Amino acid sequence: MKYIQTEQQIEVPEGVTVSIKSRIVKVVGPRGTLTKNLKHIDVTFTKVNNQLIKVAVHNGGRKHVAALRTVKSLVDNMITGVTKGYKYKMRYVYAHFPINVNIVEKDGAKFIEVRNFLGDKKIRNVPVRDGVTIEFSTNVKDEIVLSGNSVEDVSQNAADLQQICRVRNKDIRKFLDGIYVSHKGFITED
Amino acid sequence: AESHRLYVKGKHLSYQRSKRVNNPNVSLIKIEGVATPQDAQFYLGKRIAYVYRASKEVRGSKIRVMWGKVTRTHGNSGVVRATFRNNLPAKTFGASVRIFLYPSNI
């Protein structure tokens, strides 16, 4: 309908500094720094009171003001990632062959190595993205933990690990073997 | 003085024409610095010279002239219509002509 003006509100906690020139947003919290390029969205950022950032679309259509809320979610995720961080938990599902998951070094890069998936002799390597930490959780059987500041990078590494363990030439609703995201939360517990 | 010009630069664009038939009796001229018919009204009646060079010296010179004059404006963008004593040779499409300031009403 081309609304005259639409705005979204971004809350900024006390330990967080957001710098936005043009559309390059950088967020600096206690655990670290994130940077996003939003030059493809065409919005307007305006600080109010050093704890509040408004973002606005002027004379924007339906899809443009959907993208405004999308920008709000992306900046919110940056702030939440530099304050609490993101943690993704994966469980290993298998019926007969235990899936062997290890962190390995090939050449200057860490790789998540998956062995014995359905008794396969193939060895699956998933590169770990920068900022993503890998842990193997104790006191719960067959759970690997993805941890980081960027929900985008953490979730994409989780999805890479889940997608590399898809079953072929079988009925997947019977051969349910895989590595599935079981929990989507923050690093700090509260 | 480094400049001695007493004419306005112009470009011979084409003949008067429809899509597939041209009329060589009328030439279309673009005058430098003219963008509207209102501005082009200034130059109506001004003499135009096309100056060109030949190898053979004719009458004490090797550079020959074709005279004409601005008759009316053409279109919305300052192009004018011109007629010459002999029609311009159509190899001059894109060549430079000189629109003089005489006859002067100013």
């Binding site: 309908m1 081309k2 609304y3 005259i4 003006q5 307007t44 002027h58 004379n59 | 963008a35």
Partner: protein, 172 residues
């Protein structure tokens, strides 16, 4: 024909020996000129009564000028139009300074959104909305807020010359 004026057209059936002084019917017609206005008058009189141009007469045609042509008004318009597959009734709201300009906007908008040509549109009613809270379309409501103000981002400046030397800006 969107150089629209409004005319009052008053006409009647031709007086007869048995019925002198017929009932003097009147219409408000938006049209480009008086000839089209009289045509529209007879078109609507034929379509609502048993009176054709041959058996009647135009008693008066007068152009109606907007009483306050320089104050912003909210207009509610009722139309009936013909689509490709049927007839429909429609209500629209136009914010503008005069009735004729509202009706011009109406014809342009119906052409743009419904491909409805002038032939295919009957303007049932054009009435000023007396006050807010009677406006019902958000595209008019959103311009009626308090202390309205908006920018015009991305200004595009017309260039009179073919080449510019400066790689221009869109600031505004």
């Amino acid at each position: 024909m969107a150089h629209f004026k409004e005319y009052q057209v008053i006409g009647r059936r031709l007086p007869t020996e048995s019925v002198p002084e017929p009932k003097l019917f009147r219409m408000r017609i938006f049209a480009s000129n008086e000839v089209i206005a009289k045509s529209r008058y007879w078109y609507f009189l034929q379509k609502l009564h048993k009176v054709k141009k041959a058996s009647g007469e135009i008693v008066s045609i007068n152009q109606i000028n907007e009483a306050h042509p320089t104050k912003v008004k909210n207009f509610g318009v009722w139309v009936r139009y013909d689509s490709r597959s049927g007839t429909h009734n429609m209500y629209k709201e136009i914010r503008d300074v005069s009735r004729v300009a509202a009706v011009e906007t109406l014809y342009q908008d119906m052409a743009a959104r419904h491909r409805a040509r002038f032939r295919s549109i009957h303007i049932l009613k054009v009435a000023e909305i007396e006050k807010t809270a009677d406006v019902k379309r958000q595209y008019v409501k959103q311009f009626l807020t308090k202390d309205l103000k908006f920018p015009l981002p991305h200004r595009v400046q017309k260039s009179t010359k073919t080449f510019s030397y400066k790689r221009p800006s869109t600031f505004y």
